[PDB]
A paper describes a structure:
Altogether CD38 appears to be a key player in the biosynthesis of calcium messengers which are involved in a wide range of cellular functions. Thus, the catalytic transformation of NAD+ involves the formation, via a ribooxocarbenium ion-like transition state, of a unique reaction intermediate that partitions between several competing pathways such as an irreversible hydrolytic process leading to ADP-ribose and a reversible minor pathway that governs the formation of cADPR. The L-shaped structure of bCD38 consists of two distinct domains separated by a cleft and connected by a hinge region. α-Helices are found mainly in the N-terminal and membrane-proximal domain of this transmembrane protein, whereas β-sheets are preponderant in the distal C-terminal domain. The active site of bCD38 consists in a funnel-shaped cavity with a fairly rigid structure; it buries the NMN+ moiety of the substrate and its scissile bond in its deepest non-polar and least solvent accessible region, whereas the AMP moiety interacts with its more solvent-exposed region, at the entrance of the catalytic cleft.
Superposition of the E218Q mutant on the wt apo enzyme showed no differences between the structures (not shown) demonstrating the conservative nature of the mutation. This suggests that the active site geometry is maintained in the mutant and that the kinetic effects of the mutation (see below) are due to an intrinsic catalytic function of Glu218 side chain. Similarly, in the E218Q mutant, both Oε1 and Nε2 atoms of the amide group of Gln218 are interacting with water molecules and the Nε2 is at a distance of 2.9–3.0 Å from the oxygen atom of Ser185 side chain. Altogether our results indicate that the E218Q mutant still carries a measurable residual catalytic activity. Finally, the stabilization of the oxocarbenium ion intermediate by Glu218 can occur either by charge-charge stabilization or via a collapse to form a covalent acylal bond at its C1′-position. Importantly, such non-polar microenvironment-related effects could explain the residual catalytic activity of Glu218 mutants of bCD38 such as E218Q (see above).
Residue numbers in the entry:
A (entry chain B): 39 to 275
B (entry chain A): 36 to 277
Write the structure that this text describes.
Amino acid sequence: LNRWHGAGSTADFQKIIQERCDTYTQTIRPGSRSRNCQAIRQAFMSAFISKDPCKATKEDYNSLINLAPPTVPCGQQVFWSKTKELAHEYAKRRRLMTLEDTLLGYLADGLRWCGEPGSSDLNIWSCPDWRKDCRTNYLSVFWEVLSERFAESACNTVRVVLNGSLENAFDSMSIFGRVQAPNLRPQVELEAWLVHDTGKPPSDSCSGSSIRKLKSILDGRNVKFRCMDNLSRDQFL
Amino acid sequence: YSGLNRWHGAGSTADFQKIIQERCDTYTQTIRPGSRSRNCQAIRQAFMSAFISKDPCKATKEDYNSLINLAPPTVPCGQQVFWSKTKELAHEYAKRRRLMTLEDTLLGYLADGLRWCGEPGSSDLNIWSCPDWRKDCRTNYLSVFWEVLSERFAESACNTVRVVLNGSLENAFDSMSIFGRVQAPNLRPQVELEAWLVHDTGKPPSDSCSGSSIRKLKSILDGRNVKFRCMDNLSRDQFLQR
Ligand SMILES: *[C@@H]1O[C@H](CO)[C@@H](O[C@@H]2O[C@H](CO)[C@@H](O)[C@H](O)[C@H]2NC(C)=O)[C@H](O)[C@H]1NC(C)=O
Ligand SMILES: *[C@@H]1O[C@H](CO)[C@@H](O[C@@H]2O[C@H](CO)[C@@H](O)[C@H](O)[C@H]2NC(C)=O)[C@H](O)[C@H]1NC(C)=O
């Protein structure tokens, strides 16, 4: 059970998911119809429990995603890469939604989970690491599937918060670069904001090499691109 | 005969557990959302635990303490409505005015209109018969639930409370009603209570604020140091448009 190279499952995973579901559905974003959180938790567990944790497929999450698809109103989506804290504060203030503001994203944010064949329990010792063990693991596949659907459903103007205090604000291998940007629909307009740390000069900008790669992706998607830069965390918020 | 059909009251509502579950989700997510979260699985499990497999004529208030702790029947100050013998009117009034009766609390909403009881040695509801308060036992799980919920609802009342009473009855205040026996005597001291005695359209009222039964209520409220204002000679439509 301790054979993997990543940290083990969040031990109270089931309780945490269900509690977050209650908070989300009742307190944060109550919906047009009720959703049963026990059933959502049950579907989450069933996706991965008692399975080879290195044989995860997108299909395994079909039932779960169908119970709570990560869709948001047009013009209200926020994407981010390497700017977790900033992007979520920005989204909170402007009443916008990141992936972590969707039901399933809110449930899963910051958690780890995996199973073991022949066992009905979470593996709390270790779980597959995406580098050292396998990319076809249940944590990575969940976030890719969720990211795909989140990106696919974007409409009108979307925003991405990128880190202007890094050498490369755009990382082609990030989930944003690999899964989200390539799945935006034509006629979406994407605005990128390259935001730097207060009191520090930016390390990347809209005229840099990494942004060229992003524009290349978006041009092929027929996604309009407007890139802003040279602003600090304070100016952005 | 000593089997499942031995009681004089109607049996448990079929599929009680499904109904509870569905009502709890509806209530917490669509009726009164924005509020602090409640765990509906836990609430259902606590409700069942309170009575299942127990002597159906030995219910006590304490059997429901864990359920009430999960969702106390507390209403915001100034929004609470009591009623007696005016079920339809009181709930229409509460709906139109965005106020809350006992049946508008989480637990009151789950249980309204339902029946339930268990059977010793069984994990299931008795869907065949349940104890009747008058013919079998007062200390049954259905009656005791409404009694303890009523007490907690009255004890937590704050600021101005309103009661809707029936001006078309000879005695609008019945000391042996749940309102008269359990709710009024347990009102938080120093709240203020307004009573409205409402009569049916086109029928002259049968009771008023000056009658003997309202005097009995006044005496109870004086005991609780609760200020009392009573208004009468109103039809349903006059009351709703006040
Ligand atoms: C750009 O990314 C860097 C590197 O992750 C962020 O700096 C870290 O921020 C965390 C959380 O605030 C700190 O605990 C770390 O100590 C920081 N590490 C380093 C190397 O500085 C930075 O906040 C990001 N900037 C923006 C604007 O999002
Ligand atoms: C006062 O109480 C009477 C008696 O319960 C109510 O009249 C009953 O109303 C129910 C539901 O509307 C009917 O099914 C019964 O047939 C009625 N019975 C009688 C004797 O009329 C009346 O609605 C109450 N009035 C107010 C203002 O609440």
